[model samples]
Target chain A: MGPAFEFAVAMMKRNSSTVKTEYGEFTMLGIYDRWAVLPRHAKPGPTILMNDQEVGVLDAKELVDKDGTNLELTLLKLNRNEKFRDIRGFLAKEEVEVNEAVLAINTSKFPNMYIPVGQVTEYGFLNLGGTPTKRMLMYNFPTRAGQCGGVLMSTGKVLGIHVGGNGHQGFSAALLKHYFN
Target chain B: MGPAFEFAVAMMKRNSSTVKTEYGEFTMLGIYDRWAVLPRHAKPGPTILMNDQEVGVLDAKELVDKDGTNLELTLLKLNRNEKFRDIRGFLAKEEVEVNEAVLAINTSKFPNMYIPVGQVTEYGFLNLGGTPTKRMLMYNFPTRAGQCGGVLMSTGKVLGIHVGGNGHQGFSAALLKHYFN
Candidate 1:
């Protein structure tokens, strides 16, 4: 119904993925704040694949994850592979609500799926997996690593990128519009 | 040799045109700052298309162009047309230069063209197409409206959006990271 929802659904249809190796498949969103946030737990692979194209992973560095959602994400300097590109558009930052409807896409498996109907439960930090210090978009529905690194939905723009959470909760880690420039 | 060259070359190869209608064909960049920047002089028409798909244009407003350059851009509100999409990635904001080497892409015609070799000649307001009081990234080479709305190139991330300029000078509007968050 919104740009956020539209973008999420679009990514799912495209089967957007970050790294898809024999060992594991990590889903990825278009972009976001705090360095295009991704799950800290997505195991580093020998090769990085995006949009089904093999991209040379130039390098990666662990940035300061002060909140400690255990988000071990690093800003990846990728060797431009050309075919697979990320989403681009400005999703202006705005306050989200508790139980605010959202969409989440999981690109971990074939027939990569999504839930067009999802919502945000809380803002700020959550102790879902471990610490309460890490700021996150706590979703009302159950979410996991597979859904991590996907986009959070709204009317016409993406709200955030799903990072991590357990079966009990989901973490939306990408700060909306924080790093667009 | 850098991401700028790679992205510009990629878009050119892909022939990324924005609006292809009976009225005329026009190239477009992915997105931009506050209100999503575009060439103010881009002739408005009945239909609006992106990625060769029709995405209904809602409304457009000509914001103040205080720095001149005749930027009569309109902020487009796209209808939920699922087929077309934009690029999403974070290129941290940094200082740009005039006569500084840059890249340019023109998604106007077939084989959407590009100039991986370009440079800025000036900054700030110019009276080329009648003063519009705009802060523009004036390029040293001749650029046209076809490249309008295309992404301005840099080494790591996109620098700005190509809005408007004449044969004498090209303007890259949309201040780096002005509306990220």
Candidate 2:
């Protein structure tokens, strides 16, 4: 009904790019242009589904290395007539502050139907990025796993995508913004 | 120079019971007596070391199950004249509070000459204990890993052995007390 729910993309283990259903392995959250956004480490196949509906297939990807061990960005290009709306307030993007309240949405789990709050205890970098190439701002929001591949947002604006940290670290959307601009 | 230093046990990758030095795979952490304590998941071999000094060999152990996946407790018996002294204020064992300040020592990285502080964000369970046979109180301190098998303490009393969360979850010392008494 809101920003987090509308943009969330769920990646499943056994499903079709056409039809069917199952539990999510992880989530491919948010939208970068018409592309669904997630970490490459989320390990979804070339095809992707969201909320049990066929959405897209893997289109473009970025990685820190060939091994994909350190840094990664995965983009799923939507194949359907409708795509997830971009996050609300995308224009007011600002850095998440330490101790700021952020919400992490796990679309795969319930489409597990869950979300967790995290406090930005620290803000740092992922050390490299696809576009920027120096270092990327990685905000630390310590929580348990399962929120990886999801988005952590403040005030309906995405701050970053949750990648590492058992839901701990997130790289800013401004970095995601680098994909287009 | 204090409790964390004295009791810390460093488990190494390549070394001898006789002599030699190397970095640690993880820490064995504290002593339950003549036995050096760590999580079996730390995966050291039969031998254990501390500060590059050959200390002991694997002794008694208790686990929540076979396969060593879900729950584990590892013990190393001292092979020599003396072993790490137990934590001070052991007599006044108390549960760590949700905001209590705690220090975690990592003996593996430098024998990592480093420690980090955490606020006890939450306290709960490992679901079962070696001795208690029920749920174990697992305090969530939420740091990066590498401190696994170390002790996080308040004042001078040992709180719990760090086993997971990058360094988040810890079991109560009273539970560690289960081994001897």
Candidate 3:
């Protein structure tokens, strides 16, 4: 019944991607076959690692770089040689409404897990970077830098990709739906 | 079960003491029939409240102020007129052994509870303020002010009275044995 303990193990069992960039390590969320999602804001170059082993890289042809005001995403295509096990739990159709309980589960520090669970405090049009109309979700839990791309989950359903913490912000499930079929 | 979810409710149900002092509202550990424990360093006079109602005041007659280099405490005897429902879960005799998991449960914010749980990392001579050779217990959980009087519990047994958080520190149950007859 402890979602923190149980969900941490579940995310680890899937061997979710953590891409080591020139800046620092950031989490990548897998949802569709041969495809995953990261923030279009950062350059998580060449490859993504699982258990510190090289598995996937940026897709040259199908990089769905949809950077805009409403829904911004850098959809990465996985390698044909390597098997990309995309998660089936994404709430692709429905957006997580505000004030709902959610947890941002990071793939970093595997054994020593970081499960920051909190209520979605607010969602508004935040000027993240290039656009003044970028929609964002904020939660009550304080997050950290390495968790920038961690998965925000509500119950058993995947919701969004975490952005930053200071009463943390993330790209909502509504925005992530842009990457889905 | 989620200890955070379950334990938070259990503590709230007991109506644990949060004393409003000249400084700020600090937590108090209630165990003995008419006694509770706070810190010797602060002046938390007047009363302890539950549900924002005055339940008990500092018993001037039974103020057991034991300030020492090793085991320090400031035991306040609660009022006779107002029933001081002290906690029965105190591990009054033995100190909690180091490296065991612990949580500091605060009596503030009944609904929006603060349950900072972490491992008992280390315990050694820590100079909190007056005493330099104080045997303080340190945990991995990040704490804050007002929690200085919270109960440091492990499993179901009350271990110590919290002092401060910065990978928090508390006065162990071993020192707490000073007030027990």
lDDT for each residue of candidate 2 in B5-60, tens digit (9 for 90 to 100):
22321221211122112323555544534656665555555555555666556465
What is the per-candidate TM-score for chain B? Answer: 0.67, 0.59, 0.70
- Tens digits of per-residue lDDT, candidate 3, B47-152, equal 6553366655656432332463544456677675554455554454555653334344443322123343555543756656555645466666545455566566
The reply for model 1, stretches above 4 Å from the true place, is A1-4, A11-15, A21-23, A32-37, A43-46, A51-53, A61-73, A81-100, A106-110, A131-133, B1-181
Off by over 4 Å in 3: A1-181, B1-5, B12-17, B32-34, B48-51, B54-72, B80-86, B90-92, B98-102, B105-117, B121-124, B133-135, B165-178
Q: lDDT of model 3 at residue A157?
A: 56
Tens-digit lDDT string for candidate 2 (A38-146): 6655555656556566655646565453434444555556666654555433523445443333333434221222232324433444443333222234554333445
TM, every model = 0.40, 0.37, 0.51
RMSD of each candidate relative to the true structure? 17.2, 12.5, 8.1
Ranking by DockQ: 3, 2, 1
Instruction: Give the residue spans of candidate 2 off by over 4 A.
Output: A1-27, A30-36, A39-46, A49-92, A97-135, A138-158, A162-181, B1-36, B39-46, B49-72, B77-181
lDDT (Cα, tens digit) per residue for candidate 3, span A1-181: 2454345436534745666655566676666577777665545567656447675565722232246344445667767455556565445454565434444434443212334355664365665545453446666654544556666655455666666545434444234464456
Better of 1 and 2 by lDDT: 1
Model 3's C-alpha root-mean-square deviation from the true structure amounts to: 8.1
Q: What's the lDDT of the predicted structure labeled candidate 3?
A: 0.52
Please give, as one word, the docking class of candidate 1: incorrect
**DockQ per candidate, 2 decimals:** 0.01, 0.02, 0.12
| Clashes per candidate, residues 3 or more apart or on different chains | 26, 5, 1
Candidates arranged by lDDT, highest first = 3, 1, 2
Poorest stretch of ten by lDDT in candidate 3 chain A: A105-114
